[PDB]
Design a protein around this nucleic acid. Sequence first.
RNA 1: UUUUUUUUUU
RNA 2: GAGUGAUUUGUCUGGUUUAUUCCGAUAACGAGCGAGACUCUAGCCUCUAAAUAGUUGGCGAAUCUUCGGGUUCGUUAACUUCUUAGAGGGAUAAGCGGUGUUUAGCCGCACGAGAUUGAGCGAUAACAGGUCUGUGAUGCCCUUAGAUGUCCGGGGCUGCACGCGUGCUACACUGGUGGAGUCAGCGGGUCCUAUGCCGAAAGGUAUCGGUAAACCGUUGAAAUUCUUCCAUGUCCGGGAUAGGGUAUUGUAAUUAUUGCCCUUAAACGAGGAAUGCCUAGUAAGUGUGAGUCAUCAGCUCACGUUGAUUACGUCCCUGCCCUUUGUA
Lengths: 65, 185, 140, 71, 50, 100, 97, 64, 140
Amino acid sequence: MDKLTLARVTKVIGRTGSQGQCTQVRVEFINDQNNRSIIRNVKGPVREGDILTLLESEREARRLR
Amino acid sequence: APEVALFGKWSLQSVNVSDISLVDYIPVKEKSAKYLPHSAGRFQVRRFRKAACPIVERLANSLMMHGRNNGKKLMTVRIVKHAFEIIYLLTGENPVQVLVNAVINSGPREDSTRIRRQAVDVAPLRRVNQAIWLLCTGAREAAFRNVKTIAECLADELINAAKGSSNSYAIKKKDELERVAKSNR
Amino acid sequence: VQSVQTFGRKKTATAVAHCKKGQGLIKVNGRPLEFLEPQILRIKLQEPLLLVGKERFQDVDIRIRVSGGGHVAQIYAVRQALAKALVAYYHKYVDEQSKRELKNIFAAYDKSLLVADPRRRESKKFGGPGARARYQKSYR
Amino acid sequence: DKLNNMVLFDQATYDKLYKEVITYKLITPSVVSERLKVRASLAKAGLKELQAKGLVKCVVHHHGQVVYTRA
Amino acid sequence: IYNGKVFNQTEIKPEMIGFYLGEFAISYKPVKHGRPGIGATHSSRFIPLK
Amino acid sequence: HRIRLTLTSQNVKPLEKVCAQLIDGAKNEHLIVKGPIRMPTKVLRITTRKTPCGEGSKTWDRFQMRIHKRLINLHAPAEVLRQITSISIEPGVDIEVTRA
Amino acid sequence: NKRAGELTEEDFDKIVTIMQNPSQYKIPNWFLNRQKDIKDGKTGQLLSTAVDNKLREDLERMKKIRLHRGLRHYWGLRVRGQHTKTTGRKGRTVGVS
Amino acid sequence: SRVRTKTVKKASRVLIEKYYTRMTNDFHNNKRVCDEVAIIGSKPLRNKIAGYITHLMRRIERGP
Amino acid sequence: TRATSIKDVDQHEATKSIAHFLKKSGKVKVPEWSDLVKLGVNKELAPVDPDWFYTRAASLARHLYFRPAGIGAFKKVYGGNKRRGVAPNHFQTSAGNCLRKAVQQLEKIKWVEKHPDGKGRILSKQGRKDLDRIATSLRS
RNA sequence: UUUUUUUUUU
RNA sequence: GAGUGAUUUGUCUGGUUUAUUCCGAUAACGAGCGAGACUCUAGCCUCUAAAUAGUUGGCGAAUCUUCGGGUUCGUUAACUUCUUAGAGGGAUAAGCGGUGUUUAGCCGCACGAGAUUGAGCGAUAACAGGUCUGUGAUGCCCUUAGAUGUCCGGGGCUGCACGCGUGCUACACUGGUGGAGUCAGCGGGUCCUAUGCCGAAAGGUAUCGGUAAACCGUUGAAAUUCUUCCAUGUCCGGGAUAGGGUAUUGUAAUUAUUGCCCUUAAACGAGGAAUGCCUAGUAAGUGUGAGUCAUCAGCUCACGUUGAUUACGUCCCUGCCCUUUGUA
């Protein structure tokens, strides 16, 4: 059970998925002293400044090639 | 400047969005404080223009589905009006606040994609979009071949969704997606 | 005789508002603003008055004549013509400061109150029932 | 299973209408019909009587919906 | 009464009053069906190449 | 009296040329001339199938002919009409005079 | 605006009398489902099993006189000149060989 | 899209080479100049030429 | 200052009051077949209200207050969509006998005149008087 | 992951 | 230029563009077609004009009035805001920020009515694609009066165990039924038909006006809005099938032309495997006009009214374009 972590989107890496439906983005944790910045895959239209709510924050998306 | 009240009855300035992520995607107050949820505007010229549409107008827009009811925005606005009256008369608080809480609680926070599936996060805009879609879909199903009117069904769906109770259609579907997504981690 | 004449448009509906010096009257096709169908779209006609203040309308007689289009389009044309008529009156017989204030309130609330929406129906093209949709294709 | 729903008020249901229903926060023909197993037409006919007698307040009186509340 | 091909002989009974002559000389033959042929149905359109 | 000049044409340029010539003639003769009144143009549309058979994609040819009509009102009982009407003339424009 | 159960028996008797004698109570002849009967010439409203009896008699009359409509009726085909190639199929698909 | 065709580009180059003095860095001035300096059969074409001429002036100022 | 003409009141209330006045006057002779007919081909059942004639005449007078017309025009005014069963709906005019008889009764009560140009019916000198009186009675 | 065929002459 | 030659290069490494669109590099130089430009169309706005378009008044008249006003016709001046239709302007990547090879350009902002409105046209080279049943376009073949010419009378092209395609109507309370109340546009007419009278309707009858911004026609459309009853019942959903009567078109209605009235009231309870169309005034719903038309629209071609959900991506499926590569 990982705490609900809020993370703001710092930049948009670009589209991904079989049909190009997901968006790979870089997120930075909001309430974090170290400012954990990781890469995530997002469903739906996302832009810079959007705050995502990760149910679990340990997972990391494979960087786009 | 006079305070703008939806339908001239409900105040908008006393509405707050709990979800920080959805604060800027649920337009209620300030520039979005509109007397009627029927404003003939262009919210699809660019990508995120729909994010500026008032949330009540989005509800009215999504309630006019199943082509039988396609284009009847006046009927849909009346339906939302009566549903809001029922909401206030049944719960006690601002029906706009009830709708906002339902939208906050009805949007999934993790979903699945075909990249077997892969669990992914949900952008705030899609989280709001699905919230409205699930709520309207729940009301529509409950009122089909049922004595309960659409306004009564809509009122019940919003109330249960706002409370988070697992009797609303939207909450059940929201939990279904998250549970399935949690498997595809 | 202090009088101005403006117009509003929407789809095909067009409304012409003649606003003269008067005792605070607003009549659309000779009918009051409180008995214009559809009922639900009456706050749309009242919106200019609600935002600006009835006190800035009670000094004029605005007679509006609308034609073309449908009910909703005519309601929008009428409200646009009302707003533009008040602005034109305050521009031609009241101070530019008040005219600027009026424009500021109207634009802050709704841009369509002053500027016409340029959307019009797109022509149907053969091979389909409408502008974009096409007749069902059978491949066998 | 079919809704064996009565077309006119049995005496017991009639008394129930004056005792219980008047206390409901939300009063509508559909809810009273689902409660007392009465045709919705009867439900709103009886609610008109309740309004005339002054035991309920009308909040919405649309042709597509009627809503009453406890007084 | 001519039916298009032959003259159908018919006695006029009193019960035929108020009707047309053509109603008593059918112009076609009642259909009795015949074991559908090749073209019918989508499965039976294929002819082997060799 | 009101002489009505009806000039009709399928091409705008010759029609307006003739109309301007008549207006100039009337003004030169110092007549009471009523400016060119432009009647709404009449559009005749024929939409046909392009193919001479029934085969192919269903494509349609949209033909249309336009007719423009101009009205000129004159208060001229003198024979200045004869002159102004006779001098100006152009193919493709048909003019008619009425004693309204 | 009354439910049929709240009616007494003489109400039904009155209504039935009117139904069996509509002409008496100023119901015009154009309101009836059997006007100028081909056999009797009387104009009345057929009720209850009379409708089925008259349908039987009509079909029997046409079949006996060998009218085209009656022949089609007892063959079981459509009688109002509709296309029967594609619609009205209430049978079983028949295959090829 | 917003890519200027060789027609517009060549016309702009000839105009700049032949009337450098009259071409300022203002679109309206360039448009008015073109109206009398060249015979262009289309107002959109003339405006495209004038706009590209202004864009070329901005670079000419910076360098060759 | 307001509510001095039919145009200043609610048209539904205006027609209701006019029908009440016509019924009370006791001078309108209803056709014998009033309880026997439909009000146009597009309708399936006869009118639910047994006093539909008075309401129809009230509506006719109210509309005559707005524009002159004839029997043919009123047939379209009261016409509507006809459902052709398994084929698409189409516009259908209403019946003409009821309209004609109602207008003749309105003439009998000296409420409707013939057009001075002889091309329709116009609300009469007394008709305008009575209708304005009903409107100002509605007042509020 | 699976994915075999296409008569003769012209 | 390169190859004996078929053939290449020009017609590109790269960047960019909806684009062989441009920038640029370059054994090629200079050109053409196509694209673009262009024509029509939609905006938004200023000069010309309007007894076939209208307003603002002035003047008569007649209603109400809370007495201060409202509504209404019938008409002689001022003016074109509205209407019409000519002539023009207006937007262009032009201004600001970022980015890019000092480019081509791209993103965002501002200004603005608008920062890609929709169509038309549309190359080289082809297909044994369709059309001899459009043609006084046509070769060859056949036939030419016991005709395959032409006309006349009947019938058929609709015939029904069945399979498929395009569709219309529905399965219902976001509804149906009776009222009440109201808003179009494209366009048509010698045939449209106003308006009186009769008729329950269908329709009948006397005819006005119009060959038309003049009359039909202020084109009183539907969906939609407000009310009344109905309430989850195949029922007031649905109106297939069938009986009787009845108008109208036409020489003629049988194999029911179509419409009207009463009656009968079927399947259908949201539709399997599959599969179509679609990105904003669009989809969908909704009606209207025109073509066909003596009569007959569930079809097509257009027009408006009400009016959204989703996305602003990708090459995963289906394909397309360019380059390299392999090929029996």
